[PDB]
Amino acid sequence: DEGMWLMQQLGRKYAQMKERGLKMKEYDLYNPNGTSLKDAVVLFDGGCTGEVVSDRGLVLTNHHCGYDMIQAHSTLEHNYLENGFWAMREADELPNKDISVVFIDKIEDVTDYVKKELKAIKDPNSMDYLSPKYLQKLADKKAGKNFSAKNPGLSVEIKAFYGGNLYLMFTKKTYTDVRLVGAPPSSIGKFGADTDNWIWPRHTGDFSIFRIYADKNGNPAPYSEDNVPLKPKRFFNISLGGVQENDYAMIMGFPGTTHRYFTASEVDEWKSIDNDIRIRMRDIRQGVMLREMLADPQIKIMYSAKYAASQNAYKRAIGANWAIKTRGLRQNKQAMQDRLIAWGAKQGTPRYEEAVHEIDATVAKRADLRRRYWMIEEGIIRGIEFARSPIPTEDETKALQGNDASARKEAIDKIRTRYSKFANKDYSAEVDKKVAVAMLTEYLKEIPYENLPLHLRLVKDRFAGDVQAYVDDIFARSVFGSEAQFDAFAAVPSVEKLAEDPMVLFASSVFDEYRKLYNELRPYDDPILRAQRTYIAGLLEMDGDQDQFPDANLTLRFTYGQVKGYSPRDNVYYGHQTTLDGVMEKEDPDNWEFVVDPKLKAVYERKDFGRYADRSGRMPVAFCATTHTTGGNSGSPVMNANGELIGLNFDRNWEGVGGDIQYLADYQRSIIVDIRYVLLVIDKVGGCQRLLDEMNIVP
Amino acid sequence: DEGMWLMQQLGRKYAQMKERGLKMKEYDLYNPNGTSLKDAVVLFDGGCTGEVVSDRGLVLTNHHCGYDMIQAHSTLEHNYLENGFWAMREADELPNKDISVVFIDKIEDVTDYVKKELKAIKDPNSMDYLSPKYLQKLADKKAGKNFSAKNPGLSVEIKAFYGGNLYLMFTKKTYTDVRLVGAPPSSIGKFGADTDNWIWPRHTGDFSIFRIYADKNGNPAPYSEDNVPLKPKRFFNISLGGVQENDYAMIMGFPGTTHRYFTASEVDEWKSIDNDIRIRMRDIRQGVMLREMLADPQIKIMYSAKYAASQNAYKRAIGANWAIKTRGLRQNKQAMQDRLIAWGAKQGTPRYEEAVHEIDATVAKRADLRRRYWMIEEGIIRGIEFARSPIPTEDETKALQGNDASARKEAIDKIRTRYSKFANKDYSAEVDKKVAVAMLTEYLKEIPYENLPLHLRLVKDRFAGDVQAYVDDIFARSVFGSEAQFDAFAAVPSVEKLAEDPMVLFASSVFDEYRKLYNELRPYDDPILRAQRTYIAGLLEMDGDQDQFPDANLTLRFTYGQVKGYSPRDNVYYGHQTTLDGVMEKEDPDNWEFVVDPKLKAVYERKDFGRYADRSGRMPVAFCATTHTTGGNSGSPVMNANGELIGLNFDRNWEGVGGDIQYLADYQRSIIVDIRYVLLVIDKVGGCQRLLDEMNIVP
């Protein structure tokens, strides 16, 4: 069902959740002044969600969430990323530098407090109501310093919601000793992670396992050999009951961002500026990239990370536009607007209408600047690799005109380091020359001369419109065109050479214009934000908060729905559950992304499923539900009617791409790995039987 | 249900058809001694099926069956391919050169008569039992020729069935005045042409409409202004009643070929020789062709057809090999013969075990020759375009040696003409040289020196193993290597230059070996053929014809089944009926194949469906059914329980690719346009009301 609901809004949605089939008592789920299930959910490493699943602080999250920790501990001799990792005792669990989980200990509405404090500010246009700094001063005042010393391991944060109409203060408890316990092999963790991505049906066992360490009192500590497993206040029970079509499902986690209150005019800017330009520019780029990879297997190895990441956002823009074309996302947002404008007339408050119109006027005023910004961002900053070639720092330049021959040698070395990072083993000068001519030919068509970055004027003024000649010249004459050319510079480096380096001048010139457009555009955000406060204040006051959730902002939200398949198109049905069968169907042993693990393949043939198979002897892999999730929800616990853990959220289907702006009940689905499958893999692929022992597994 | 059954087999199968939902009386479907539905079926233009749907000789078949006729009547001022075509009176219907329809007027079993005649052949290994030249003699004798003079418009033919254990004599009624009446625009006839090819779901309105003209008596006659519409013996009534899941469907038509009685050793050869080599060699070919098409907009246009043509049987091979890999085709065939061998033991007759062993032994003996044939057929004869460059005829050679200038120039003219048709507007020697190098490298890798075509020995001996320099030389020195080179030859021709022309030597040498290998493999066919006659005789004696149909052979068969969807893979369920919404869902005005017709589009937005809509107010397009069809069944009528026309067959799903060898009930499906959609396009897109008025449309 629609919405990413504040924990504070559980009471107000408890009956609908009962309607859909929630069995828990409300306070067992979220208790605002005691222990509850909420206390078992964590923000994992700042972006993902995870959950505690044993009284020794064992934490589950996605494989894609643990990926970096698994890679950092992997080499040629012991490639955990490929083979997996299962520490057979707690001492073999690996610490991670720069890792966190965070608990949401307390949450409290501090709206009236914050609004009282905001009346002390003179300027009625102050943006302090959304300043993190200001909001932190208020938080520190209420807590209030020395709060962190008096409460070791806790901190406080205030955040804004409903465009500045509601304020929450969060008391967080943060741990930074979190060790890798286990992960499956990449053939399970990422089964088809580029082809099957954004896609249902899905067969990916996207999980990994960690453990929170603490000091002997259970309070936070940085890594030390003294530290011992956390004994948490709450962990999730794992259920073997499985799922059935229409079963209740709910999620807690940390959705990042949504745009639920966009005006129609913002839908038009979003479609015809952000997305069209992204789609256009990324088509040209991927064009040249694809043909170069097909024409050379070396280039294919080098450019398929970069080509891949260019898709995973391009594709999101294709899908987003498809939602405006076919799902009337615009007319939906126009309707919300008019309902409110009418309503403001009936009440004799015209300010709602004025807010909407102040947004439209602002959107209209900034359209060419924004178009120029997106052109340069997508076309040059993201689009041409030599856009990010090295530029000397102040300090470096200063050294190269000094007399300190060794400060001369140090500055060169920092640049040699950045040069080799730019021109690494995945960089091809010739590929990027091709990419550049295409991207620049599109950029100069779409951007008139007197709006160009200063160095791009040279194409007309010096190369007689010849873009090839301009790019060739950059590489022929630059100290960053080849290893040779850089080396020759480093031998007799003058500050004068770098000042005329045409690649330096390019990279600087385009960055000046990116920066300049960004700064010109920044003042246009304030009126839209101020107008939104009013717009949303109106929307809440007219209907209510009950069917109008607050935009996500990387705070703890819950969402509910049912396990349910859907129909993506005429005469097709996807059901609610995938099976291990479906993994084997997709096998292609000569495709990296569809490799099937020898032990898993073997566990399949021998039907060796413990009591992790379903009512008919089929081994489940993944299921999907009507929950409302987004980026940030990676690793979120999925709970059955008794708040028992039934799976981990890991993706959203491509038909719900536009669900950060409008939710589509018949299409949007959360994509969840089945907890039975997670266990099977622990048990039968890992053989890491100690982890099943410590969970509290139930019917 | 499995089977392409003989009309002779209707009585044996009639109960099974009643069980599946058949209503009508047997003898209204097929009667040897009078009029029956069978009389409404035609062999349309050699390879398609069609059906008579009015008392004035109106004929429906597929659009892809009517394609060439439509394209032949299209100029730029009136492009009927693009816009459709609708004659508004019978006198506007457009004649067609080299066209026919063929009724099957009678069918007699002539097994005994054919067996008697074959005892007078002394050699017990004569292949006369399968000879068309011979069987036509026995036909002529039985029919007392001059039969075609005594009965103008009629003719006779005998064919063999069940590998020579059953003969039928057909009496054919051939009309050759057959005129274009109605086509929908290609956007409907070929909606999704190549994306949706071999695919369910499907949204393609694949029909066209013709009329049979004849003389005053309704007797056949070539085109003439004096000709008027044929009053046929039977036409189909058209049903507005529609389809539901599990409704009886049945088809009549002319399936081309099947290999249902393959031995498991025939399956293994087909996989590892025939299919694997085509897959290997076409992958290569197609790769090189893609690079170049992506590389140059003009090569794409030049080479798109040829690439698609290569893609056809490549995809078809890929599917067959899926089915062997995962559906146990070989096991099914192995089981077949295992049962008959066991049963033959029991009878005390080794006949069958001796036969199967012979097939085994012959398939083993011919494997290297056959591996060589497929390597040369896929690798060069089809792979390399300049393999089909001109070779001088006996006659042209003979004229370039004479003293006859007139004959010398006529020779050159003929050669110029074949040169222009080979080096035509779609021909690129750069592309051809690139393909040729990829393909020859694989060929010289597989095929050793002693088995090369003679000219290919030059790579090793003359060009130091450098395939690229060989192809360079062929083009550099050949008279067919460029237009100018040819013209320098035409000015001063001589046999000696053609004799030493490296391209002529290449194309001669590769065709010599191709012919040569074809000829050495020819003797191996007879043992297999004769052994098959015994093998199929044994299976029939053992298990009867009940659930054992005779291989297709371009003769009239019936098939039955039910309208039913299916699950193509895990968690995916395709249903039985597609809708006009599905068309709309696919609209994509930039992509050529998914353009939607404005007038069709408008009928949808108006819900202007008359009595064509299904009872829930939705407009059907296509349906699928478990009928057993193959190539030859294009345009075939689909009938309901009462034998009323409910649709037109036009494709098979790829999931059923192995259907010609192994029928896959849960997976294989005939793809059928709903006759209600057909009428919709006549009514609301043609506006061609007279065609509906002349039909008999029942509820």
Coordinates of N, CA, C and O in Angstrom, one line a residue, chain A residues 493-583:
Chain A
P493 N 59.5 20.8 -16.0 CA 58.2 21.4 -15.8 C 58.2 22.9 -15.6 O 59.0 23.3 -14.7
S494 N 57.5 23.7 -16.4 CA 57.3 25.1 -16.1 C 55.8 25.3 -15.8 O 55.0 24.7 -16.4
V495 N 55.5 26.2 -14.9 CA 54.1 26.6 -14.7 C 53.5 27.2 -15.9 O 52.3 27.0 -16.1
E496 N 54.3 27.8 -16.8 CA 53.8 28.3 -18.1 C 53.2 27.2 -19.0 O 52.2 27.3 -19.6
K497 N 53.9 26.0 -19.1 CA 53.3 24.9 -19.8 C 51.9 24.5 -19.4 O 51.0 24.4 -20.2
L498 N 51.7 24.4 -18.1 CA 50.4 24.0 -17.5 C 49.3 25.0 -17.7 O 48.2 24.7 -18.1
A499 N 49.7 26.3 -17.5 CA 48.8 27.4 -17.9 C 48.3 27.4 -19.4 O 47.1 27.7 -19.6
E500 N 49.1 26.9 -20.3 CA 48.6 26.8 -21.7 C 48.2 25.3 -22.1 O 47.8 25.1 -23.3
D501 N 48.2 24.4 -21.2 CA 47.9 23.0 -21.6 C 46.5 23.0 -22.1 O 45.6 23.4 -21.3
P502 N 46.2 22.6 -23.3 CA 44.9 22.7 -23.8 C 43.9 21.7 -23.1 O 42.7 22.0 -23.0
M503 N 44.4 20.6 -22.6 CA 43.5 19.8 -21.8 C 43.2 20.4 -20.4 O 42.1 20.3 -19.9
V504 N 44.2 21.1 -19.8 CA 44.0 21.8 -18.6 C 43.0 22.8 -18.8 O 42.1 22.9 -18.0
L505 N 43.2 23.6 -19.8 CA 42.3 24.8 -20.1 C 40.9 24.3 -20.4 O 40.0 25.0 -20.0
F506 N 40.8 23.1 -21.1 CA 39.5 22.5 -21.3 C 38.8 22.2 -20.0 O 37.7 22.7 -19.6
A507 N 39.5 21.4 -19.2 CA 39.0 20.9 -18.0 C 38.6 22.0 -17.0 O 37.6 21.9 -16.3
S508 N 39.4 23.0 -17.0 CA 39.1 24.2 -16.1 C 37.9 24.9 -16.6 O 37.1 25.3 -15.8
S509 N 37.9 25.2 -17.9 CA 36.9 26.0 -18.5 C 35.5 25.4 -18.4 O 34.5 26.2 -18.1
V510 N 35.4 24.1 -18.6 CA 34.1 23.5 -18.4 C 33.7 23.4 -17.0 O 32.5 23.6 -16.7
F511 N 34.7 23.2 -16.1 CA 34.4 23.3 -14.6 C 34.0 24.7 -14.1 O 33.1 24.8 -13.3
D512 N 34.5 25.7 -14.7 CA 34.1 27.1 -14.3 C 32.6 27.2 -14.7 O 31.9 27.8 -13.9
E513 N 32.2 26.7 -15.8 CA 30.8 26.9 -16.4 C 29.8 26.0 -15.6 O 28.7 26.4 -15.5
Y514 N 30.3 24.8 -15.2 CA 29.5 24.0 -14.4 C 29.2 24.6 -13.0 O 28.1 24.6 -12.5
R515 N 30.2 25.2 -12.5 CA 30.2 25.8 -11.2 C 29.4 27.1 -11.2 O 28.6 27.4 -10.4
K516 N 29.7 27.9 -12.2 CA 28.9 29.2 -12.5 C 27.4 29.0 -12.7 O 26.6 29.7 -12.1
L517 N 27.0 27.9 -13.4 CA 25.6 27.6 -13.6 C 25.0 27.1 -12.3 O 23.8 27.5 -12.0
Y518 N 25.7 26.3 -11.6 CA 25.3 25.8 -10.3 C 25.0 27.0 -9.4 O 24.0 26.9 -8.7
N519 N 25.9 28.0 -9.3 CA 25.7 29.1 -8.4 C 24.6 30.0 -8.8 O 23.9 30.6 -8.0
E520 N 24.4 30.2 -10.1 CA 23.3 31.0 -10.6 C 22.0 30.3 -10.3 O 21.0 31.0 -10.1
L521 N 22.0 29.0 -10.4 CA 20.7 28.3 -10.2 C 20.4 28.1 -8.7 O 19.2 27.9 -8.4
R522 N 21.3 28.2 -7.8 CA 21.1 28.0 -6.4 C 20.1 28.9 -5.7 O 19.2 28.5 -5.1
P523 N 20.2 30.2 -6.0 CA 19.1 31.1 -5.5 C 17.7 30.8 -6.0 O 16.8 31.2 -5.3
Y524 N 17.5 30.1 -7.1 CA 16.1 29.7 -7.4 C 15.5 28.6 -6.6 O 14.4 28.3 -6.7
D525 N 16.3 27.9 -5.7 CA 15.8 26.9 -4.9 C 15.0 27.4 -3.7 O 14.0 26.8 -3.3
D526 N 15.4 28.5 -3.2 CA 14.7 29.0 -2.0 C 13.2 29.3 -2.2 O 12.4 28.8 -1.4
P527 N 12.8 30.1 -3.2 CA 11.4 30.3 -3.4 C 10.5 29.0 -3.5 O 9.4 29.0 -3.0
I528 N 11.1 28.1 -4.3 CA 10.4 26.8 -4.5 C 10.2 26.2 -3.1 O 9.1 25.8 -2.8
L529 N 11.3 26.1 -2.3 CA 11.2 25.5 -1.0 C 10.2 26.2 0.0 O 9.3 25.5 0.5
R530 N 10.3 27.5 0.2 CA 9.3 28.3 0.9 C 7.9 28.1 0.4 O 7.0 27.9 1.2
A531 N 7.7 28.2 -1.0 CA 6.4 27.8 -1.5 C 5.9 26.4 -1.2 O 4.7 26.2 -1.1
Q532 N 6.8 25.4 -1.1 CA 6.4 24.0 -0.8 C 5.9 23.9 0.6 O 4.9 23.2 0.9
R533 N 6.5 24.6 1.6 CA 6.1 24.6 3.0 C 4.6 25.0 3.0 O 3.8 24.3 3.6
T534 N 4.2 26.0 2.2 CA 2.9 26.5 2.2 C 2.0 25.5 1.4 O 1.0 25.0 1.9
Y535 N 2.5 25.1 0.3 CA 1.7 24.1 -0.6 C 1.3 22.8 0.2 O 0.2 22.5 0.3
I536 N 2.3 22.2 0.9 CA 2.1 21.0 1.7 C 1.3 21.3 3.0 O 0.5 20.5 3.4
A537 N 1.5 22.4 3.6 CA 0.7 22.8 4.8 C -0.8 22.8 4.3 O -1.6 22.3 5.1
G538 N -1.0 23.4 3.2 CA -2.4 23.3 2.6 C -2.8 21.9 2.3 O -4.0 21.5 2.7
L539 N -2.0 21.1 1.7 CA -2.4 19.7 1.4 C -2.7 18.9 2.7 O -3.7 18.1 2.7
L540 N -1.9 19.0 3.7 CA -2.2 18.4 5.0 C -3.5 18.8 5.6 O -4.3 18.0 6.1
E541 N -3.7 20.2 5.6 CA -4.9 20.8 6.2 C -6.2 20.5 5.5 O -7.3 20.6 6.1
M542 N -6.2 20.1 4.2 CA -7.4 19.9 3.4 C -7.9 18.5 3.4 O -9.1 18.3 3.6
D543 N -7.0 17.5 3.2 CA -7.4 16.1 3.4 C -6.9 15.8 4.7 O -7.7 15.9 5.7
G544 N -5.6 15.4 4.9 CA -5.1 14.9 6.1 C -3.8 14.3 5.9 O -3.4 14.1 4.7
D545 N -3.1 13.9 6.9 CA -1.8 13.2 6.8 C -2.1 11.7 6.4 O -1.2 11.1 5.9
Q546 N -3.3 11.2 6.7 CA -3.5 9.8 6.5 C -3.3 9.2 5.1 O -2.9 8.1 5.0
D547 N -3.5 10.0 4.0 CA -3.3 9.5 2.7 C -2.4 10.3 1.8 O -2.6 10.5 0.6
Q548 N -1.3 10.8 2.5 CA -0.3 11.8 2.0 C 0.9 11.7 3.0 O 1.0 12.5 3.9
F549 N 1.8 10.8 2.7 CA 2.9 10.5 3.5 C 4.0 11.6 3.3 O 4.1 12.1 2.2
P550 N 4.9 11.8 4.3 CA 6.0 12.8 4.1 C 7.1 12.3 3.3 O 7.6 11.2 3.5
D551 N 7.7 13.2 2.4 CA 8.8 12.8 1.6 C 9.9 12.2 2.4 O 10.2 12.6 3.5
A552 N 10.5 11.1 1.8 CA 11.6 10.4 2.4 C 12.8 11.3 2.6 O 13.0 12.3 1.8
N553 N 13.5 11.1 3.7 CA 14.7 11.9 4.0 C 15.8 11.1 4.8 O 16.3 11.6 5.7
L554 N 15.9 9.8 4.4 CA 16.9 9.0 5.1 C 16.6 8.9 6.7 O 17.6 8.7 7.5
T555 N 15.4 8.9 7.0 CA 14.9 8.6 8.4 C 14.1 7.3 8.4 O 13.6 6.9 7.4
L556 N 13.9 6.7 9.6 CA 13.2 5.5 9.7 C 11.7 5.7 9.4 O 11.0 6.5 10.0
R557 N 11.3 5.0 8.4 CA 9.9 4.8 8.0 C 9.5 3.3 7.9 O 10.3 2.5 7.7
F558 N 8.2 3.1 8.1 CA 7.6 1.8 7.9 C 6.6 1.9 6.7 O 6.1 3.0 6.5
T559 N 6.4 0.8 6.1 CA 5.5 0.7 5.0 C 4.8 -0.6 5.1 O 5.5 -1.6 5.6
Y560 N 3.6 -0.8 4.6 CA 2.9 -2.1 4.7 C 2.3 -2.4 3.4 O 1.9 -1.5 2.6
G561 N 2.1 -3.7 3.2 CA 1.2 -4.2 2.0 C 1.0 -5.7 2.1 O 1.0 -6.2 3.2
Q562 N 0.8 -6.3 0.9 CA 0.6 -7.7 0.8 C 1.6 -8.3 -0.2 O 1.9 -7.7 -1.1
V563 N 1.9 -9.6 0.0 CA 2.6 -10.4 -1.0 C 1.7 -10.7 -2.2 O 0.8 -11.4 -2.1
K564 N 2.1 -10.2 -3.4 CA 1.1 -10.2 -4.5 C 1.9 -10.1 -5.8 O 2.8 -9.3 -5.9
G565 N 1.6 -10.9 -6.8 CA 2.1 -10.7 -8.1 C 1.4 -9.6 -8.8 O 0.6 -8.9 -8.2
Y566 N 1.6 -9.4 -10.1 CA 1.0 -8.4 -10.9 C 1.0 -8.7 -12.4 O 1.6 -9.7 -12.7
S567 N 0.3 -7.9 -13.2 CA 0.4 -8.1 -14.6 C 1.1 -6.9 -15.3 O 0.6 -5.8 -15.3
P568 N 2.3 -7.1 -15.9 CA 3.0 -6.0 -16.5 C 2.5 -5.5 -17.9 O 2.8 -4.4 -18.3
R569 N 1.7 -6.4 -18.5 CA 1.1 -6.1 -19.8 C 0.1 -7.1 -20.2 O 0.0 -8.2 -19.6
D570 N -0.7 -6.7 -21.2 CA -1.7 -7.6 -21.8 C -1.2 -9.1 -21.9 O -0.2 -9.4 -22.5
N571 N -2.1 -9.9 -21.3 CA -1.9 -11.3 -21.3 C -0.7 -11.9 -20.7 O -0.3 -13.0 -21.0
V572 N 0.0 -11.2 -19.8 CA 1.1 -11.7 -19.0 C 0.8 -11.5 -17.5 O 0.3 -10.5 -17.1
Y573 N 1.1 -12.5 -16.7 CA 1.1 -12.4 -15.2 C 2.4 -12.9 -14.6 O 2.9 -14.0 -14.9
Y574 N 3.0 -12.1 -13.8 CA 4.1 -12.5 -12.9 C 3.4 -12.8 -11.6 O 2.6 -12.0 -11.1
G575 N 3.7 -13.9 -11.0 CA 3.2 -14.3 -9.7 C 4.1 -13.7 -8.5 O 5.1 -13.0 -8.7
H576 N 3.7 -14.1 -7.3 CA 4.3 -13.6 -6.1 C 5.6 -14.3 -5.7 O 6.3 -13.7 -4.9
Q577 N 6.0 -15.4 -6.3 CA 7.1 -16.2 -5.8 C 7.9 -16.8 -6.9 O 7.4 -17.4 -7.8
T578 N 9.2 -16.6 -6.9 CA 10.2 -17.3 -7.7 C 10.6 -18.6 -6.9 O 10.4 -18.7 -5.7
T579 N 11.3 -19.5 -7.7 CA 11.8 -20.8 -7.2 C 13.2 -21.1 -7.6 O 13.7 -20.4 -8.5
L580 N 13.8 -22.1 -6.9 CA 15.2 -22.4 -7.3 C 15.2 -22.9 -8.8 O 16.2 -22.6 -9.5
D581 N 14.2 -23.6 -9.2 CA 14.0 -24.0 -10.6 C 14.4 -22.9 -11.5 O 15.3 -23.0 -12.3
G582 N 13.7 -21.7 -11.3 CA 14.0 -20.5 -12.1 C 15.4 -20.0 -12.1 O 15.8 -19.4 -13.1
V583 N 16.2 -20.3 -11.1 CA 17.6 -20.1 -11.1 C 18.2 -21.0 -12.2 O 18.9 -20.5 -13.1

